[PDB]
């Protein structure tokens, strides 16, 4: 029966959250991790081995691949999710330590403190999501073409190179974009709810 | 002995379900995951490495493979099962939170609320199953041929390409189709049972 | 001490079983899974990479391998064991739910029902085992030859192809055949025992 | 504190065993599994990929490798250890069921039975160990040479083939032989001890 | 409820630490391990297979790769983190044994001892971090170029070699540098806090 | 609270050990296993695939690699650590059985026995460490060169072969040597401490 304290921690963490936000956002996180781990990761395995270019010049393939893909999508998404998730872990740790301190105080001697941190955490989650989306839009966009044109040394003039699994990667990119937009919308809804409940005093 | 609450949750979740539906559908889910994870996943490993075409044109193999297989069957099935499974997780979370709230109410102060959500969840499960089946039928069908004809640039004119393990993949496709049909039938039976028990009032 | 209920479930499941059948069949199942997972699976890894044919015709190797091996032995055995095992899982789930219902009845209000299902489960186990054995005999037999003759398009005339690790695979095939025969014999013995104890009334 | 029953089972299983046999044989089993899993398994990975022969004849490498290595050492040892280990599992299951039955009898109604089975189990362990050793001696011996001579069709006349990592495999073969001999000696010692304690009555 | 002793150990370990240092440094450690394990490790997989040089001389690629990369970044970072982490494990073990001894003393008979060790541990953590940073700066720097010039035997004169994924590796190098700097700053802050609280007596 | 017996076993095992030896040696063991498993194992993966020799003679590479590396360093270290660790496991098992027997005696009937075994275990640990170090020194030494000269049949005259990652392997070899020396020194210190405390009687 060593689970009541965990329930108390869960209740105290979600004091200012809405009823449906909990379920929707947690299930979205689970869906995100499962999709990233099971199917998405396997499709990018042969991203460089199957990358080919039409030329006899040694070294052109390496530089052209580097230019086309400065960073892989999967690792970009891993960084995105880690950055989005860290603030909640920080908040949980802070709440745990605060609860221990309060237990000490209330045992030995038989708003604003936490609300501000929660608001800051939600704001930073949204900011990171938006920043990652903007960076992805600026760098790659939201689609991939089968043929790429390379004009980098030591390749002479321009050369044509061919990618691997472009359509499938485009589909998964669209899926991840939709997931990110949904998460951002839910966080914004939570912010509006907290502010609109705080205005009434 | 910290298991009674889990039993209470299980009983409350399955209030409106039939006796045999529980067992049949749960065992079907276990069978589905085991089949997808153990045998099916390994057969598609060399889907692109062993794919070959008769030509000297560089890049033709990549584009022809992309055209033939816009998305792999295994990842399509993973998406299908995730979409079919998420609604039950949402319902479980909702029931858990509702039970906690009711415990609070009934401790401190010593139909339609949940039935509608259950019906909606079952309906969405069936809808997703049917939609995925229709998409699969429209895109690929339910069989694979050994020889494929490719007429995409930069391949000149038309070329012939050869697949890997077509018969085995066809067999597994038929198996998965049967599993999906059985699941859809069971969900429809559950819907009919709930409606026919609700008509009598 | 939250294990007495598990013992009650175990005792109720094995009410009509013999003393030695439990041990022999469970240990046989463990042996089967270990043998299939540790050694058998690794020997078939290079089943297609090491498959070679004497010809310059592109695509002949793919079609000849597909014709020779419509389905791999390992996946066939995985399907066989899953089909043989599912009925017991169904019976366990049914017994669990029945026990919960009986506990409810006997707490709030302080043969043939299950025997038939057990007999049906044993019969279906035996039927599946026999059917899989017959299919394997019809398709492949119980041995593999080092040289295969291929007469499928686009291969011109007939060609000779060579397999990988035929003797070892033959040995493992014989092992699995013996295991299947032993399991079938044990199930038949259980059926005869139950019927011969039921005749006496 | 749900561990006393496990201790009772352990004590009842080892009623007729010697003091040091327990420790020595259990640690030997752990050593065997660790050695087989960590280092031995990795050395045989490139057993066929690195196998090469001096000829242009297609298919000669496959048949020559099959002739040289009808079965791999690692899988042979896996089978050996499984066969040696199963009897103890059978004995444990029998003891568990017997203990449950005796508890039932002694609760509701408030030598030779097991000794024979234990002796049989030890005898079968020793017999399997000796048989596997004899088979290994007859087939391969206890050493491997770097050069192999192949005289099987379709190879013309005789050809020379070269193995991978012969010295390391020889070293590990000697290690496993020593382990098997030690296990056999310990089992024989246990048999002699039980018989010499039973003679005195 | 066998968790109170763990809480006592946690409280005693963190007696002299600041409130926010706990959370920030622990979350930083988790972030570090996750980043090193999920994304960073996969990008260096084809570090040598995809490394290519322009020459027909056999053996030049091996020596040139060895000269360019005396040690991989990932393994260097693994060593760095292990060295940074070991002192805390030592301190935890010492505290555990001291607590057991004190419990013995205070049951049977019904500053400076630990502060010095904690200060030493923090100092060694910082020293190791700084030393690893200096070594990395001296050997590689904090960037990678696409083209490398090799002048080692048996390569004739000088040759040009090409790396794999230079930009992505540079990005991850910068990330790890930032993480290391943050950790060093936090440790220095902890040292200053302890000394400034000890000066006041 | 089923952990007191584990604490009693831990205390009884470490009756004659020093205060700091426990922590230092246990942390050294953890460091050893982590270093061997995470970084060291990956660097030797392409030990044979990337091994190349300058010749057209088939089979020369195999024999030259076998001559250069009769056994891999990683597997040698695995054997070393297993041999060093087994005696402590034997001692733990002996202590466990002795404690059970003493509990039986002291419940039903309401130095030198163990010290000698502990001394023997420490001595054998040190002996194995020294023997493995001597064997490694005699066979390989403590460094690796980039170029190897091979004079084994069927290679004609002498040939030059090139290794993979020599500098990194040398670094790790030095690390492991330092670890082994530290462990040997700690064991010798423990032996001296026990003897010097036993002399005083
Ligand atoms: C914050 C957490 C970061 C998440 C993250 O990035 O992990 C990715 C997925 O990992 C993962 O979490 C992989 C999850 C694998 C789950 C597979 C089995 C689940 C089936 C469900 C059980 C049903 C009962 C990394 O990517 P990576 O770790 O995969 O890349 C390594 C391939 N070596
Ligand atoms: C909702 C859950 C999603 C299920 C799902 O898609 O997982 C698939 C199977 O994973 C899996 O669940 C793999 C299951 C592996 C089980 C193998 C051992 C079970 C034996 C039974 C024990 C008997 C006692 C993914 O596919 P993937 O994760 O395999 O692809 C990665 C290869 N790296
Ligand atoms: C009903 C259950 C289905 C059984 C089944 O088909 O699983 C096979 C073996 O899985 C398995 O169960 C693999 C078992 C691996 C066990 C290895 C370690 C056991 C050592 C014993 C511990 C002693 C203490 C699948 O085949 P697959 O999952 O292997 O194919 C995937 C390679 N990725
Ligand atoms: C475990 C820690 C030992 C503490 C202990 O005494 O546990 C005993 C159970 O034995 C046991 O601990 C048996 C557990 C067996 C599984 C643990 C080993 C796993 C790996 C084995 C690989 C195969 C070899 C109970 O004894 P008690 O003091 O409560 O006396 C009760 C007599 N009425
Ligand atoms: C009866 C049991 C059969 C034993 C058996 O044959 O298993 C072998 C080793 O498995 C194994 O048991 C592998 C054991 C792997 C252990 C590695 C980590 C242990 C480190 C110790 C922890 C210290 C704290 C199979 O061979 P295989 O399963 O390896 O072949 C599959 C490669 N996919
Ligand atoms: C866990 C859930 C927290 C609930 C909880 O309060 O547990 C406390 C133990 O702290 C802990 O929970 C410490 C557990 C440490 C391991 C869990 C983290 C694993 C991953 C860490 C990676 C490295 C960073 C006990 O506190 P109490 O309320 O009973 O007060 C007793 C004071 N006398
Ligand atoms: C001190 C500890 C040393 C840390 C360390 O160096 O481990 C690295 C990462 O290991 C790791 O710790 C790998 C972590 C893998 C985690 C993937 C799944 C986590 C998803 C989160 C779950 C959310 C719920 C080694 O590198 P390596 O072990 O990877 O190299 C082996 C590839 N065979
Ligand atoms: C006595 C025990 C023998 C130790 C031993 O030799 O195991 C080595 C390392 O195993 C291992 O123990 C591998 C350890 C892998 C740990 C990776 C994740 C740890 C991160 C820390 C978590 C922080 C929270 C074997 O080598 P091998 O088993 O690797 O070779 C197999 C690659 N298939
Ligand atoms: C090695 C271990 C320590 C890493 C995995 C453990 C934690 C990092 C896990 C446990 C619970 C997880 C959280 C569960 C659900 C949410 C949903 C979501 O949080 C919300 O803002 C939604 C509201 C809520 O669910 O509380 C963002 C991810 C997050 C914080 C997860 C982030 C990762 C967490 C903290
Ligand atoms: C990382 C973890 C959180 C993912 C795995 C845990 C859950 C997602 C699992 C636990 C129980 C599973 C469920 C068990 C059985 C069913 C059968 C089936 O549900 C039904 O409608 C049948 C009726 C019933 O069994 O209740 C559909 C899948 C589902 C919900 C499963 C979906 C996945 C669930 C929710
Ligand atoms: C992911 C999890 C849910 C899958 C693994 C759990 C179950 C599917 C396991 C637990 C116990 C296993 C059973 C243990 C032993 C038997 C022996 C045998 O059953 C018998 O008819 C023998 C008589 C008996 O042992 O009861 C056939 C396999 C079976 C049912 C096993 C089938 C697989 C079972 C049900
Ligand atoms: C998937 C699971 C069910 C497989 C692994 C669990 C069992 C098969 C393990 C648990 C304990 C193991 C046993 C522990 C130690 C011994 C030593 C040895 O037995 C003896 O005769 C020595 C005397 C003794 O230790 O009792 C032979 C292997 C054996 C039986 C082991 C065989 C494998 C056992 C039964
Ligand atoms: C196989 C097992 C034994 C290895 C993994 C277990 C330990 C080595 C883990 C458990 C807790 C971890 C610690 C948790 C957090 C910190 C943060 C940080 O410590 C600090 O100085 C911050 C202050 C604090 O958190 O106490 C440095 C890493 C460290 C000690 C971790 C190092 C690795 C530790 C000791
Ligand atoms: C599959 C399982 C059974 C294998 C892993 C479990 C054991 C083999 C582990 C548990 C505790 C480990 C021990 C923990 C620490 C030590 C340090 C060291 O022992 C000492 O002499 C130092 C003094 C001490 O720590 O007691 C040598 C390794 C050893 C015995 C370890 C050897 C491996 C042990 C026995
Ligand atoms: C596999 C080896 C063959 C095992 C067959 C053993 C069958 C013996 C049955 C004993 C009596 C059961 C009631
Ligand atoms: C061409 C030589 C084939 C030899 C096959 C021998 C296989 C023996 C299998 C024994 C099975 C034992 C049943 C458990």
Residue numbers in the entry:
A (entry chain B), B (entry chain A), C (entry chain F), D (entry chain E), E (entry chain C), F (entry chain D): 2 to 111, 148 to 238
Describing publication, verbatim:
Because the hydrophobic pore region formed by TM1 and TM2 helices (referred to as the transmembrane pore region) was almost completely covered by POPE and CHS molecules in the Cx43 GJICh structure under condition 7, the empty space inside should have been filled with hydrophobic or amphipathic molecules, although their map densities would not have been clearly seen in the structure. In the structure processed with C1 symmetry, we found that many density blobs formed a thin layer at the extracellular end (referred to as the extracellular layer) of the transmembrane pore region in each hemichannel part. When we gradually decreased the map contour level, we found that the inner densities appeared slightly earlier than the outer densities and that their sizes grew at almost the same rate. Because the inner densities were located immediately next to the heads of the lipids bound to the channel interior and were as strong as the densities of the lipid heads outside, they were likely POPE heads. This suggests that phospholipids in the intracellular layer may not be highly ordered probably due to six NTHs, and thus the cytoplasmic end of the central pore formed by six N-termini may not be completely closed by lipids.
Gap junction intercellular channels (GJIChs) facilitate direct communication between adjacent cells and play important roles in various biological processes such as cardiac contraction, electrical coupling, cell differentiation, and death. GJIChs are formed when two opposing hemichannels (also called connexons) from adjacent cells are docked, each being composed of six connexin (Cx) protomers. Cx43, also known as GJA1, is the most ubiquitously expressed connexin protein.
